[PDB]
Structure 1
Amino acid sequence: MNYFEMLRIDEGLRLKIYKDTEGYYTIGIGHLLTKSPSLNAAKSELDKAIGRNCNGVITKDEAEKLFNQDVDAAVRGILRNAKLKPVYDSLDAVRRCALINMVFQMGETGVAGFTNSLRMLQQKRWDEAAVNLAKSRWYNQTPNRAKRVITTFRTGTWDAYKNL
């Protein structure tokens, strides 16, 4: 299992504009379009993102393309970020996927503020980290997805996604 499949599970696939858990206009596999309330602003962003008049609808291939771009961005964001890079470098390949997942979901910026957890992760205090991660708005808002990522950091296996 890799970070692409993991995110495909957590985000779903939706071919028509929809609102995400925060009420923002999204399309595809968790591709945020605009935090603006206008359906018009969204469709506009959408069209600029795809390079065609989509009228609020995209194909599977278009969704997968957006997805690869967003994944690449999360990865490149971790590697460029002074707080995130050292953690990521310290992790094994499975836990690396978990960090990527957080970054895709909440942005570089958001993840970089979980200072305490990042430090635990680097020190490989898995249990302590799992506990600190859970005390967040993130966990309270999207508890099932957050448990899945937290278990991945805790055990270093794909158990939480093998169910699914």
Structure 2
Amino acid sequence: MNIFEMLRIDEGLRLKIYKDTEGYYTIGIGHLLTKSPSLNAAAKSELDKAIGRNTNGVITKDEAEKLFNQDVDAAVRGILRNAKLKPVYDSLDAVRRAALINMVFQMGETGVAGFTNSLRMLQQKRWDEAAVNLAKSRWYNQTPNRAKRVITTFRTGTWDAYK
């Protein structure tokens, strides 16, 4: 198992513009297009600009994967540039690094950076405590199944939640 496979399970693959769990316009493998309520312009506009062609709200599998590669790359690089995230990432093992990349992909660097307390516990290797803390969040309450998977990953340092 690896980051791409992990995120592919968490986000799924949709070739037509869709609304995410928060009602935002997304496409492919969790690629957010816009937070705006306008489909026919705004979202489709963003989509065409992202892809480089007149799409009509539908993309191909290769197109989805191209967006996905960019987004994973961005996530990693964002973590590495973030004063708050970098040190946590550096302190972790390969499996847990993947769990942090996942949270970053879903919520944004800024969002993850706010789990101050959890971050400090992860850095200290206090696995069970960090898991408990991570669960007291809107994140866990809104997308509990996915959150539990990421949390188990941090807790165990294994890919069990995904197998």
Normalised by the shorter chain, which TM-score bucket? over 0.9
Q: Provide the C-alpha distance between the structure 2 equivalents of 1:98 and 1:12, rounded to a whole number of angstroms.
A: 17
Which string of whole-angstrom CA distances, capped at 9 and with x for unpartnered residues, describes residues 92-124 of structure 1?
000000000000000000000000000000000
**Match of residue 103 from structure 2:** 102
Identity over the aligned pairs, expressed in percent? 98
Q: Provide the C-alpha distance between the structure 2 equivalents of 1:102 and 1:56, rounded to a whole number of angstroms.
A: 27
Normalization by structure 1: what TM-score? 0.98
Gaps of 5+ in 2: none
C-alpha deviation, 1:140, in angstroms: 0.1
Which string of whole-angstrom CA distances, capped at 9 and with x for unpartnered residues, describes residues 32-66 of structure 1?
00000000200000000000000000000000000
CA RMSD of aligned residues (A): 0.3
**Match of residue 21 from structure 1:** 21
Q: How many residues align?
A: 162
Q: Provide the C-alpha distance between the structure 1 equivalents of 2:53 and 2:106, rounded to a whole number of angstroms.
A: 26
C-alpha deviation, 1:84, in angstroms: 0.2
Secondary structure of 2:59's match?
Answer: coil
Secondary structure of 1:42's match?
Answer: helix
Q: Provide the C-alpha distance between the structure 2 equivalents of 1:31 and 1:53, rounded to a whole number of angstroms.
A: 18
Which string of whole-angstrom CA distances, capped at 9 and with x for unpartnered residues, describes residues 10-50 of structure 1?
00000000000000000000000000000020000000000
**Match of residue 157 from structure 2:** 156
Gaps of 5+ in 1: none
Secondary structure of 1:18's match?
Answer: strand
Normalization by structure 2: what TM-score? 0.99
Q: Provide the C-alpha distance between the structure 2 equivalents of 1:82 and 1:48, rounded to a whole number of angstroms.
A: 31
